[PDB]
Design an enzyme around this catalytic site. Structure first.
Site, short mmCIF file in Angstrom:
data_model
loop_
_atom_site.label_atom_id
_atom_site.label_comp_id
_atom_site.label_asym_id
_atom_site.label_seq_id
_atom_site.Cartn_x
_atom_site.Cartn_y
_atom_site.Cartn_z
N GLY A 141 0.08 6.03 0.43
CA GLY A 141 -0.68 7.06 0.69
C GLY A 141 -0.44 7.78 2.02
O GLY A 141 0.21 7.06 2.79
N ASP A 147 -10.24 6.42 10.08
CA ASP A 147 -9.94 5.78 8.63
C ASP A 147 -10.56 4.56 8.60
O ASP A 147 -9.89 3.57 7.79
CB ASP A 147 -8.61 5.79 8.10
CG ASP A 147 -8.32 5.79 6.80
OD1 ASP A 147 -9.33 6.13 5.82
OD2 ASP A 147 -7.20 5.79 6.33
N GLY A 171 3.30 7.78 3.18
CA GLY A 171 3.96 6.63 3.75
C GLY A 171 3.72 5.44 2.62
O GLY A 171 2.82 5.58 1.60
N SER A 172 4.47 4.22 2.78
CA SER A 172 4.13 2.99 2.17
C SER A 172 4.16 1.65 2.96
O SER A 172 5.02 1.87 3.95
CB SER A 172 5.01 2.81 0.78
OG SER A 172 6.25 2.48 1.42
N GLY A 197 0.92 -1.19 -0.03
CA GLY A 197 0.03 -0.02 0.05
C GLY A 197 0.98 1.13 0.11
O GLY A 197 2.01 1.25 0.26
C1 LIG Z 1 -6.69 -3.92 0.27
N1 LIG Z 1 -6.53 -3.78 -0.83
N2 LIG Z 1 -6.06 -3.52 1.12
C2 LIG Z 1 -4.83 -2.41 0.90
C3 LIG Z 1 -4.90 -1.17 1.00
C4 LIG Z 1 -3.50 -0.58 1.48
C5 LIG Z 1 -2.88 -1.81 2.33
C6 LIG Z 1 -1.68 -1.51 3.14
C7 LIG Z 1 -1.44 -2.64 3.95
C8 LIG Z 1 -2.01 -4.07 3.84
C9 LIG Z 1 -1.79 -5.17 4.48
N3 LIG Z 1 -2.01 -6.28 4.05
C10 LIG Z 1 -1.54 -7.48 4.53
N4 LIG Z 1 -1.11 -7.48 5.68
C11 LIG Z 1 -0.88 -6.48 6.39
N5 LIG Z 1 -0.47 -6.24 7.76
C12 LIG Z 1 -0.36 -4.67 7.78
C13 LIG Z 1 -0.87 -4.14 6.81
C14 LIG Z 1 -1.18 -5.21 5.80
C15 LIG Z 1 -3.23 -4.27 2.84
C16 LIG Z 1 -3.68 -2.72 2.07
#
Ligand SMILES: *C(=N)N[C@H]1CCc2ccc(-c3ncnc4[nH]ccc34)cc21
Length: 272
Positions: A18, A128, A21-22, A16
């Site tokens: 935005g 959020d 950050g990333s 991700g």
């Molecule tokens: C769905 N498409 N969600 C994404 C939007 C941006 C983002 C950031 C981080 C994750 C994420 N995915 C799996 N495991 C994690 N552990 C902490 C964050 C995450 C998903 C999305």
């Protein structure tokens, strides 16, 4: 154990981006043989942003719940969290809609509500809450993630006022946030009503909060629509009791919205 060395974090892919950050998918591989565990690592890409990022880390580190994404540690610089390979609820619902029934959606709703009741007990306003920020641990277990905008309420005030308007898609904001940039545990209840809407539409893009509100209707236009008492329509085949709960979450005044503690047993009753 909560201290990760940078040299051992192997970049895999982007999860991700935005809000300056990333989040990246990394392997924590101290042996260097590709056998290490996968982790989700957030980093900043200004002096204010540094303070905001440090606040996010301090918030997440102090949260301990089965319904909140787990903090693993820091690298000295980066926030290390558990990686949930099923990803966010928004995409999970779109992929598995034909296999998930109303009872399963009510199970997720109850878990998100329990996570939110816990956040509120910690005086934390998420700001959020959306299906894109809810992660899937398993077929029967979801967790709240993305504390990038989260704020802690001072002991003597139940709300927080922001100087500049928000940068998130406007369709999850409570009217008082749209009009006066006021955020509280009650504006998180409003957002929760939109999450219930997302769950019961299986995050279908064609009737998403953006697609449907834009069809019904920009920030002034949405505020006008909401003040008139217009709301998102009941999702296709939504159980009436669920839609009634969304409308309560969308009470015009924050003091009239139910609390997460009051919503919890109501969702558990509908599930059983
Ligand atoms: C769905 N498409 N969600 C994404 C939007 C941006 C983002 C950031 C981080 C994750 C994420 N995915 C799996 N495991 C994690 N552990 C902490 C964050 C995450 C998903 C999305």
């Amino acid at each position: 154990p909560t201290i990760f060395e940078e040299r051992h974090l192997k970049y895999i892919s982007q999860l991700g981006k935005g809000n300056f950050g990333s989040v990246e998918l990394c392997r924590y591989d101290p042996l260097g043989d590709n056998t290490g565990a996968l982790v989700a690592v957030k980093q900043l890409q200004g002096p204010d942003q540094q303070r905001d990022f440090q606040r996010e880390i301090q918030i997440l580190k102090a949260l301990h719940s089965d319904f909140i994404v787990k903090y693993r540690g820091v690298s000295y610089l980066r926030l290390v969290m558990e990686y949930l390979p099923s990803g966010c609820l928004r995409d999970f619902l779109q992929r598995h809609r034909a296999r998930l029934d109303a009872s399963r959606l009510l199970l997720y709703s109850s878990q998100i509500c329990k996570g939110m009741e816990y956040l509120g007990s910690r005086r934390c306003v998420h700001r959020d809450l959306a299906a894109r920020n809810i992660l899937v641990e398993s077929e029967a277990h979801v967790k709240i993630a993305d504390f990038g905008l989260a704020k802690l309420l001072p002991l003597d005030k139940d709300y927080y006022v922001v100087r500049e308007p928000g940068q998130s898609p406007i369709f999850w904001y409570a009217p008082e946030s749209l009009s006066d940039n006021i955020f509280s545990r009650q504006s998180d209840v409003w957002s929760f009503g939109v999450v219930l809407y997302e769950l019961f539409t299986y995050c279908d893009k064609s009737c998403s909060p953006s697609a449907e509100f834009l069809r019904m209707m920009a920030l002034s236009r949405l505020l006008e629509l909401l003040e008139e008492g217009q709301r998102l329509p009941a999702p296709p085949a939504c159980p009436a009791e669920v839609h009634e709960l969304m409308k309560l979450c969308w009470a015009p005044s924050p003091q009239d919205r139910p609390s997460f503690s009051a919503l919890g047993p109501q969702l558990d009753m509908l599930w059983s």
